[PDB]
Short mmCIF file of N, CA and C (backbone and C1' of nucleotides) in Angstrom, two decimals:
data_model
loop_
_atom_site.label_atom_id
_atom_site.label_comp_id
_atom_site.label_asym_id
_atom_site.label_seq_id
_atom_site.Cartn_x
_atom_site.Cartn_y
_atom_site.Cartn_z
N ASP U 1 118.13 117.40 104.60
CA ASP U 1 117.90 116.07 105.75
C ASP U 1 119.00 115.37 106.16
N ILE U 2 119.90 116.18 106.95
CA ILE U 2 120.78 115.63 107.70
C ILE U 2 120.32 115.01 108.92
N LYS U 3 118.99 115.38 109.33
CA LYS U 3 118.24 114.64 110.22
C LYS U 3 117.71 113.39 109.91
N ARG U 4 117.70 113.02 108.43
CA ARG U 4 117.41 111.68 108.05
C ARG U 4 118.24 111.49 106.62
N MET U 5 119.39 110.88 106.39
CA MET U 5 120.18 110.75 105.30
C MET U 5 119.37 109.94 104.42
N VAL U 6 119.40 110.34 103.31
CA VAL U 6 118.94 109.71 101.90
C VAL U 6 119.92 109.15 101.47
N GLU U 7 119.96 107.66 100.95
CA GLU U 7 120.74 106.87 100.39
C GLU U 7 121.03 106.96 99.11
N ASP U 8 120.47 107.62 98.35
CA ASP U 8 121.08 107.86 97.14
C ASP U 8 121.38 109.16 97.08
N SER U 9 121.65 110.16 98.15
CA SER U 9 121.96 111.45 97.76
C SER U 9 123.64 111.02 97.97
N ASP U 10 124.41 112.01 97.22
CA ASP U 10 125.96 111.98 97.40
C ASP U 10 126.50 112.45 98.93
N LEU U 11 125.81 113.18 99.04
CA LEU U 11 126.42 113.83 100.15
C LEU U 11 126.27 112.78 101.62
N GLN U 12 127.41 112.98 102.62
CA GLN U 12 127.52 112.14 103.60
C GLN U 12 127.34 112.85 105.19
N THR U 13 127.29 112.02 106.15
CA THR U 13 127.40 112.70 107.47
C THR U 13 128.62 112.83 108.30
N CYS U 14 129.20 113.77 108.78
CA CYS U 14 130.28 114.12 109.50
C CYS U 14 129.94 115.01 110.62
N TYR U 15 130.92 114.77 111.56
CA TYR U 15 130.62 114.83 112.99
C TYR U 15 131.90 115.84 113.40
N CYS U 16 131.54 117.00 113.89
CA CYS U 16 132.69 118.09 114.08
C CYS U 16 132.60 117.89 115.67
N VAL U 17 133.61 117.39 116.31
CA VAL U 17 133.32 117.34 117.88
C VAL U 17 134.11 118.75 118.32
N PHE U 18 133.31 118.94 119.49
CA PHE U 18 134.37 120.32 120.53
C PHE U 18 134.04 120.12 122.05
N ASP U 19 134.21 118.78 122.26
CA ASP U 19 134.22 118.98 123.73
C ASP U 19 134.46 117.09 124.04
N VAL U 20 135.03 117.05 125.40
CA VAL U 20 135.10 115.60 125.72
C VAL U 20 134.64 115.60 127.05
N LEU U 21 134.20 114.88 127.66
CA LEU U 21 133.48 114.59 128.95
C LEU U 21 133.82 113.50 129.61
N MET U 22 134.62 112.42 129.08
CA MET U 22 135.00 111.25 130.07
C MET U 22 135.80 110.57 128.69
N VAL U 23 137.08 109.74 129.43
CA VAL U 23 137.71 109.03 128.61
C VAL U 23 138.44 107.94 129.49
N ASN U 24 138.03 106.88 129.34
CA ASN U 24 138.76 106.00 130.11
C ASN U 24 138.90 106.15 131.59
N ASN U 25 137.52 105.78 132.13
CA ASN U 25 137.26 105.99 133.56
C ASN U 25 137.96 107.27 134.26
N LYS U 26 137.82 108.16 133.53
CA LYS U 26 138.39 109.57 134.04
C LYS U 26 137.47 110.84 133.53
N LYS U 27 136.66 111.26 134.44
CA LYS U 27 135.81 112.67 134.13
C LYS U 27 136.70 113.59 134.00
N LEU U 28 136.27 114.19 132.84
CA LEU U 28 136.89 115.71 132.46
C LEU U 28 135.53 116.89 132.71
N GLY U 29 134.71 116.37 133.01
CA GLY U 29 133.79 117.77 133.14
C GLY U 29 134.08 118.82 134.14
N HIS U 30 134.77 118.60 135.05
CA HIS U 30 135.14 119.49 135.87
C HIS U 30 136.56 119.93 135.82
N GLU U 31 136.87 119.69 134.74
CA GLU U 31 138.11 120.17 134.20
C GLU U 31 138.01 121.59 133.17
N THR U 32 139.30 122.18 133.03
CA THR U 32 139.06 123.44 132.22
C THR U 32 139.22 123.05 130.73
N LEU U 33 138.42 124.32 130.23
CA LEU U 33 138.24 123.97 128.60
C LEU U 33 139.62 123.50 128.22
N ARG U 34 140.81 124.36 128.56
CA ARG U 34 141.96 124.07 127.92
C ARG U 34 142.43 122.56 127.96
N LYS U 35 142.11 121.92 129.05
CA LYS U 35 142.98 120.51 129.13
C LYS U 35 141.87 119.77 128.56
N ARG U 36 140.42 119.84 128.37
CA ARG U 36 139.57 119.01 127.33
C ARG U 36 140.02 119.20 125.93
N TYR U 37 140.14 120.43 125.64
CA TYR U 37 140.78 120.98 124.20
C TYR U 37 142.01 119.93 124.33
N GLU U 38 142.90 120.08 124.82
CA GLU U 38 144.13 119.07 124.74
C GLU U 38 143.88 117.54 124.67
N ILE U 39 143.10 117.42 125.42
CA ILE U 39 142.93 115.84 125.77
C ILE U 39 141.96 115.29 124.23
N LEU U 40 141.20 116.20 123.75
CA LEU U 40 140.53 115.93 122.54
C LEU U 40 141.33 115.58 121.07
N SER U 41 142.59 115.70 121.36
CA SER U 41 143.60 115.57 120.34
C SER U 41 144.12 114.39 120.33
N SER U 42 144.04 113.67 121.53
CA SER U 42 144.58 111.97 121.91
C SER U 42 143.59 111.25 122.13
N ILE U 43 142.28 111.40 121.09
CA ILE U 43 141.42 110.06 121.42
C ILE U 43 141.16 109.56 119.55
N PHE U 44 141.17 110.44 118.85
CA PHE U 44 140.94 110.06 117.30
C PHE U 44 141.71 111.15 116.98
N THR U 45 142.47 110.45 115.43
CA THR U 45 143.06 111.16 114.54
C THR U 45 141.98 111.32 113.58
N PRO U 46 141.56 112.46 113.12
CA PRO U 46 140.52 112.82 112.08
C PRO U 46 140.93 112.66 110.77
N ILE U 47 139.93 112.10 110.31
CA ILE U 47 139.66 111.80 108.94
C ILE U 47 138.58 112.40 108.03
N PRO U 48 139.34 113.49 106.97
CA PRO U 48 138.46 114.47 106.55
C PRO U 48 137.30 113.62 105.98
N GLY U 49 136.07 114.61 106.39
CA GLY U 49 134.73 114.17 105.72
C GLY U 49 133.66 113.30 106.65
N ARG U 50 134.48 112.63 107.76
CA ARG U 50 133.18 111.91 108.42
C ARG U 50 133.91 112.17 110.13
N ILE U 51 134.75 112.67 110.44
CA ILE U 51 134.96 113.24 112.13
C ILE U 51 135.88 113.99 111.92
N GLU U 52 135.81 115.21 112.72
CA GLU U 52 136.76 116.18 112.51
C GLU U 52 136.49 117.12 113.82
N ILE U 53 137.56 117.88 114.09
CA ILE U 53 137.89 118.52 115.36
C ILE U 53 137.76 120.06 114.90
N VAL U 54 136.93 120.80 115.73
CA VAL U 54 136.67 122.27 115.46
C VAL U 54 137.89 123.06 115.75
N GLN U 55 138.44 124.08 114.78
CA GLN U 55 139.53 124.19 115.21
C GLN U 55 139.30 126.06 115.94
N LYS U 56 139.92 125.94 117.29
CA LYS U 56 139.77 127.31 117.94
C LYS U 56 141.02 128.28 117.54
N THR U 57 140.66 129.51 117.86
CA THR U 57 141.98 130.36 117.57
C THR U 57 141.97 131.33 118.91
N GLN U 58 143.23 131.29 118.98
CA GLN U 58 143.23 132.27 120.62
C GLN U 58 143.25 133.88 120.12
N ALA U 59 142.51 134.78 121.07
CA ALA U 59 142.30 135.89 120.68
C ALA U 59 142.00 136.75 121.76
N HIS U 60 142.60 137.94 122.06
CA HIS U 60 142.50 138.99 123.42
C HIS U 60 142.01 140.34 123.06
N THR U 61 141.13 140.41 122.03
CA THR U 61 141.11 142.10 121.73
C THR U 61 139.57 141.62 121.04
N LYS U 62 138.77 143.10 120.89
CA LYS U 62 137.35 142.98 120.38
C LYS U 62 137.48 143.08 118.77
N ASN U 63 138.66 143.86 118.36
CA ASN U 63 138.77 143.78 117.08
C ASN U 63 139.08 142.67 116.61
N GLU U 64 139.77 141.37 117.36
CA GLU U 64 139.76 140.05 116.43
C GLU U 64 138.35 139.59 116.58
N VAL U 65 137.68 139.46 117.43
CA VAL U 65 136.37 138.96 117.49
C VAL U 65 135.46 139.82 115.82
N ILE U 66 135.63 140.78 115.79
CA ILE U 66 135.09 141.69 114.66
C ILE U 66 135.44 141.39 113.20
N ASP U 67 136.89 141.22 113.14
CA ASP U 67 137.41 140.56 111.86
C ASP U 67 136.85 139.31 112.05
N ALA U 68 136.76 138.35 112.86
CA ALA U 68 136.35 136.86 112.74
C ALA U 68 134.92 136.99 112.23
N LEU U 69 133.92 137.87 112.96
CA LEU U 69 132.64 138.00 112.39
C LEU U 69 132.76 138.45 111.15
N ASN U 70 133.47 139.36 110.19
CA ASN U 70 133.29 139.96 109.07
C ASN U 70 133.85 138.61 108.05
P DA E 1 37.80 41.83 48.15
"O5'" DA E 1 37.38 42.55 49.75
"C5'" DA E 1 35.75 42.00 49.74
"C4'" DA E 1 35.47 42.24 51.55
"C3'" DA E 1 36.14 43.31 52.10
"O3'" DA E 1 34.68 43.72 53.16
"C1'" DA E 1 37.04 41.75 53.22
P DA E 2 35.02 45.33 53.39
"O5'" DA E 2 35.33 45.01 55.07
"C5'" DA E 2 34.11 44.34 55.84
"C4'" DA E 2 34.74 44.16 57.32
"C3'" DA E 2 35.06 45.48 58.02
"O3'" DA E 2 34.35 45.04 59.50
"C1'" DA E 2 36.96 43.67 57.94
P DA E 3 34.72 46.58 60.30
"O5'" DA E 3 35.62 45.85 61.52
"C5'" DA E 3 35.41 44.61 62.01
"C4'" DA E 3 36.54 44.35 63.23
"C3'" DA E 3 36.73 45.34 63.97
"O3'" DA E 3 37.48 44.84 65.49
"C1'" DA E 3 38.92 44.48 62.72
P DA E 4 37.88 45.77 66.37
"O5'" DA E 4 39.36 45.33 67.11
"C5'" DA E 4 39.45 43.86 67.10
"C4'" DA E 4 40.81 43.53 67.65
"C3'" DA E 4 41.70 44.66 68.69
"O3'" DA E 4 42.66 43.75 69.30
"C1'" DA E 4 42.44 44.63 66.34
P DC E 5 43.37 44.79 70.33
"O5'" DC E 5 44.76 44.70 69.78
"C5'" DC E 5 45.72 43.62 69.44
"C4'" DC E 5 46.88 43.62 68.84
"C3'" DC E 5 47.81 44.72 69.62
"O3'" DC E 5 49.47 44.05 69.84
"C1'" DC E 5 47.42 45.36 67.41
P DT E 6 50.50 45.13 70.53
"O5'" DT E 6 51.13 45.59 69.62
"C5'" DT E 6 51.66 44.67 68.45
"C4'" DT E 6 52.53 45.45 67.45
"C3'" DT E 6 53.27 46.70 67.90
"O3'" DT E 6 54.70 46.74 67.67
"C1'" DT E 6 51.84 47.93 66.79
P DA E 7 55.88 47.64 67.96
"O5'" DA E 7 56.16 48.73 66.39
"C5'" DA E 7 55.94 47.99 65.11
"C4'" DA E 7 56.72 48.86 64.22
"C3'" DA E 7 57.52 50.09 64.91
"O3'" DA E 7 58.58 50.71 63.70
"C1'" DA E 7 55.77 51.24 64.38
P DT E 8 59.62 51.50 63.75
"O5'" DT E 8 59.31 52.81 63.72
"C5'" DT E 8 58.99 52.89 61.86
"C4'" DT E 8 58.28 54.20 62.00
"C3'" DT E 8 59.32 55.46 62.63
"O3'" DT E 8 59.44 56.46 61.22
"C1'" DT E 8 56.93 55.46 63.28
P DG E 9 60.26 57.60 61.77
"O5'" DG E 9 59.48 58.74 61.44
"C5'" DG E 9 58.79 59.10 60.53
"C4'" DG E 9 57.71 60.10 60.75
"C3'" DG E 9 58.36 61.49 61.26
"O3'" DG E 9 57.37 62.59 60.67
"C1'" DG E 9 56.50 60.60 62.62
P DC E 10 58.62 64.00 60.68
"O5'" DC E 10 57.49 64.89 61.70
"C5'" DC E 10 56.10 64.87 61.19
"C4'" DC E 10 55.12 65.39 62.59
"C3'" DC E 10 56.10 66.32 63.16
"O3'" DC E 10 54.99 67.62 63.21
"C1'" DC E 10 55.37 64.67 64.82
P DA E 11 55.37 69.07 63.87
"O5'" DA E 11 54.74 69.26 65.21
"C5'" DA E 11 53.12 68.99 65.06
"C4'" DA E 11 52.65 69.27 66.06
"C3'" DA E 11 52.69 70.20 67.31
"O3'" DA E 11 52.10 70.76 68.11
"C1'" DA E 11 53.56 68.34 68.32
P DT E 12 52.01 72.26 68.73
"O5'" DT E 12 52.39 71.88 70.44
"C5'" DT E 12 51.32 71.07 70.86
"C4'" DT E 12 52.15 70.84 72.32
"C3'" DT E 12 52.85 71.94 72.77
"O3'" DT E 12 52.16 72.36 73.92
"C1'" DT E 12 54.14 69.43 72.74
P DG E 13 52.65 73.81 74.38
"O5'" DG E 13 53.24 72.83 75.81
"C5'" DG E 13 52.76 72.51 76.79
"C4'" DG E 13 53.70 71.85 77.95
"C3'" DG E 13 54.22 72.54 78.45
"O3'" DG E 13 53.97 72.57 80.26
"C1'" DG E 13 55.88 70.67 77.60
P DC E 14 54.54 73.96 81.43
"O5'" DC E 14 56.07 73.22 81.63
"C5'" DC E 14 56.19 71.61 82.11
"C4'" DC E 14 57.68 70.93 82.25
"C3'" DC E 14 58.31 71.95 82.98
"O3'" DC E 14 59.08 71.26 83.88
"C1'" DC E 14 59.51 71.02 80.87
P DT E 15 59.88 71.79 85.45
"O5'" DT E 15 61.42 71.88 84.78
"C5'" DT E 15 61.71 70.19 84.44
"C4'" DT E 15 63.04 70.06 83.85
"C3'" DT E 15 64.21 71.08 84.77
"O3'" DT E 15 65.05 70.04 84.91
"C1'" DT E 15 64.19 71.49 82.04
P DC E 16 66.73 70.97 85.86
"O5'" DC E 16 67.66 71.05 84.85
"C5'" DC E 16 67.85 70.12 84.04
"C4'" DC E 16 69.12 70.30 82.80
"C3'" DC E 16 70.16 71.18 83.29
"O3'" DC E 16 71.34 70.84 82.75
"C1'" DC E 16 69.19 72.21 81.83
P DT E 17 73.03 71.41 83.73
"O5'" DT E 17 73.63 72.35 82.44
"C5'" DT E 17 74.21 71.47 81.43
"C4'" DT E 17 74.29 72.56 80.14
"C3'" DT E 17 75.39 73.64 80.35
"O3'" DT E 17 76.39 73.69 79.28
"C1'" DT E 17 73.31 74.85 79.59
P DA E 18 77.56 74.44 79.33
"O5'" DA E 18 77.34 75.50 78.18
"C5'" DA E 18 78.21 76.71 77.56
"C4'" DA E 18 77.71 77.34 76.64
"C3'" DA E 18 78.45 78.68 76.43
"O3'" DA E 18 78.47 79.14 74.80
"C1'" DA E 18 76.15 78.89 76.83
P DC E 19 79.83 80.41 74.63
"O5'" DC E 19 78.78 81.67 74.77
"C5'" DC E 19 77.89 81.87 73.86
"C4'" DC E 19 77.37 83.46 74.16
"C3'" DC E 19 77.97 84.57 74.35
"O3'" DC E 19 77.41 85.61 73.69
"C1'" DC E 19 75.90 84.17 76.02
P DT E 20 78.83 87.04 73.40
"O5'" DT E 20 77.47 88.08 74.10
"C5'" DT E 20 76.48 88.51 72.95
"C4'" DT E 20 75.75 89.41 74.17
"C3'" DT E 20 76.18 90.51 74.81
"O3'" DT E 20 75.49 91.59 74.45
"C1'" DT E 20 75.56 89.34 76.39
P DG E 21 76.00 93.22 74.26
"O5'" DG E 21 75.36 93.38 75.73
"C5'" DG E 21 73.81 93.88 75.74
"C4'" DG E 21 73.67 94.10 77.61
"C3'" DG E 21 74.18 95.14 78.08
"O3'" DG E 21 73.24 96.09 78.73
"C1'" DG E 21 74.34 93.15 79.27
P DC E 22 73.62 97.61 79.45
"O5'" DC E 22 73.28 97.32 80.80
"C5'" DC E 22 72.15 97.14 81.11
"C4'" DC E 22 72.44 97.03 82.74
"C3'" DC E 22 72.72 97.85 83.78
"O3'" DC E 22 72.29 98.29 84.98
"C1'" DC E 22 73.97 95.83 84.07
P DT E 23 72.39 99.48 85.96
"O5'" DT E 23 73.12 98.78 87.30
"C5'" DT E 23 72.47 97.61 88.04
"C4'" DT E 23 73.32 96.84 88.97
"C3'" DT E 23 74.09 98.09 89.94
"O3'" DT E 23 74.13 97.75 91.45
"C1'" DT E 23 75.68 96.61 89.14
P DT E 24 74.61 98.58 92.08
"O5'" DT E 24 75.59 97.87 93.26
"C5'" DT E 24 75.50 96.49 93.49
"C4'" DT E 24 76.88 96.02 93.67
"C3'" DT E 24 77.62 96.60 94.75
"O3'" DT E 24 77.98 95.91 95.48
"C1'" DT E 24 78.79 96.13 92.93
P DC E 25 78.84 96.18 96.97
"O5'" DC E 25 80.23 95.57 97.10
"C5'" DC E 25 80.37 94.39 96.70
"C4'" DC E 25 82.05 94.15 96.26
"C3'" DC E 25 83.09 94.67 97.32
"O3'" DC E 25 83.95 93.62 97.77
"C1'" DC E 25 83.66 94.86 94.76
P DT E 26 84.91 94.02 98.72
"O5'" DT E 26 86.18 93.73 98.12
"C5'" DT E 26 86.84 93.05 97.25
"C4'" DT E 26 88.03 93.31 96.43
"C3'" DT E 26 89.14 94.33 97.10
"O3'" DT E 26 90.19 93.32 96.97
"C1'" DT E 26 88.22 95.37 94.64
P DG E 27 91.44 93.75 97.79
"O5'" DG E 27 92.30 94.43 96.51
"C5'" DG E 27 92.50 93.45 95.30
"C4'" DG E 27 92.91 94.39 93.74
"C3'" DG E 27 94.59 95.34 94.55
"O3'" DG E 27 95.50 95.11 93.69
"C1'" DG E 27 92.81 96.65 93.55
P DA E 28 96.86 95.35 94.00
"O5'" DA E 28 97.06 96.97 93.34
"C5'" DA E 28 97.38 96.77 91.74
"C4'" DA E 28 96.94 98.06 90.89
"C3'" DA E 28 97.97 98.88 92.00
"O3'" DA E 28 98.87 99.47 90.65
"C1'" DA E 28 96.16 100.10 91.69
P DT E 29 100.20 100.19 91.08
"O5'" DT E 29 99.70 102.01 91.02
"C5'" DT E 29 99.19 102.43 89.84
"C4'" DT E 29 98.69 103.96 90.03
"C3'" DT E 29 99.28 104.82 90.55
"O3'" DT E 29 100.05 105.67 89.67
"C1'" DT E 29 97.24 104.72 91.39
P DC E 30 100.90 107.09 90.04
"O5'" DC E 30 100.14 108.07 90.57
"C5'" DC E 30 99.09 108.26 89.32
"C4'" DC E 30 98.22 109.73 89.88
"C3'" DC E 30 99.10 110.88 90.97
"O3'" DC E 30 98.77 111.95 90.59
"C1'" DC E 30 97.45 109.87 92.33
P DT E 31 99.53 113.27 90.54
"O5'" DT E 31 98.44 113.78 91.90
"C5'" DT E 31 97.09 114.35 91.58
"C4'" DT E 31 96.51 114.61 93.16
"C3'" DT E 31 97.25 115.88 93.96
"O3'" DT E 31 96.14 116.57 94.31
"C1'" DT E 31 97.06 114.02 95.63
P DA E 32 97.06 118.10 94.70
"O5'" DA E 32 96.72 118.00 96.54
"C5'" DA E 32 95.19 118.31 96.60
"C4'" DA E 32 95.16 117.62 98.35
"C3'" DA E 32 96.07 118.64 99.21
"O3'" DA E 32 95.09 119.13 100.12
"C1'" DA E 32 96.65 116.26 99.80
P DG E 33 95.51 120.52 101.30
"O5'" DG E 33 95.79 119.66 102.77
"C5'" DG E 33 95.02 118.72 103.34
"C4'" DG E 33 95.53 117.85 104.21
"C3'" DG E 33 96.25 118.70 105.42
"O3'" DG E 33 95.69 118.38 106.77
"C1'" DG E 33 97.60 116.45 104.38
P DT E 34 96.46 119.05 107.60
"O5'" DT E 34 97.02 117.85 108.48
"C5'" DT E 34 96.60 116.60 108.64
"C4'" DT E 34 97.51 115.89 109.57
"C3'" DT E 34 98.25 116.49 110.72
"O3'" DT E 34 98.31 115.54 111.90
"C1'" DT E 34 99.74 115.32 109.50
P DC E 35 98.70 116.11 113.52
"O5'" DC E 35 100.08 115.35 113.65
"C5'" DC E 35 99.91 113.85 113.46
"C4'" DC E 35 101.35 113.68 113.83
"C3'" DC E 35 102.48 114.17 114.81
"O3'" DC E 35 103.13 113.57 115.39
"C1'" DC E 35 103.43 114.52 112.82
P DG E 36 103.89 113.74 116.92
"O5'" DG E 36 105.32 112.86 116.97
"C5'" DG E 36 105.92 112.93 115.64
"C4'" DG E 36 107.37 112.48 116.02
"C3'" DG E 36 108.02 112.95 117.01
"O3'" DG E 36 109.31 112.46 117.39
"C1'" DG E 36 108.65 114.20 115.02
P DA E 37 109.57 113.21 119.06
"O5'" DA E 37 110.80 114.05 118.49
"C5'" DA E 37 112.03 113.76 117.79
"C4'" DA E 37 112.57 114.43 116.85
"C3'" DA E 37 112.82 115.79 117.74
"O3'" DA E 37 114.06 116.03 118.59
"C1'" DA E 37 112.24 116.26 115.58
P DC E 38 115.02 117.02 119.08
"O5'" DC E 38 115.30 117.76 117.82
"C5'" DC E 38 116.82 117.09 116.90
"C4'" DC E 38 116.87 118.03 115.95
"C3'" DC E 38 116.99 119.34 116.44
"O3'" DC E 38 118.42 119.56 116.81
"C1'" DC E 38 115.93 119.34 114.19
P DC E 39 118.79 121.23 117.49
"O5'" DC E 39 118.50 122.10 116.48
"C5'" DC E 39 119.85 122.13 115.28
"C4'" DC E 39 119.39 123.11 114.43
"C3'" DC E 39 119.43 124.75 114.64
"C1'" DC E 39 117.40 124.06 113.62
#
DNA sequence: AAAACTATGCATGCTCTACTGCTTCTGATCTAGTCGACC
């Protein structure tokens, strides 16, 4: 039940962010994914266990996709 | 010496106050099921 955390449970809630759509009266929804990913590193400094940024890896072949799936 | 008045004990009924047993109401507990929302 991440849907409803229990107080006695040892595990806690974590937020893995993979997009930003607005920062300081600047609308990022019409921008490219590259620029939003770049901006996402200038909003918060992640602290493991509570808030994090999902890692994206560059790839330009099908074999890379298959290796990641495996 | 005989008769009338009064005292005390006892029977009698009725009324009132504790104790035991049956029935019903409430509280507490457990078990089973439903719903919100996600995925």
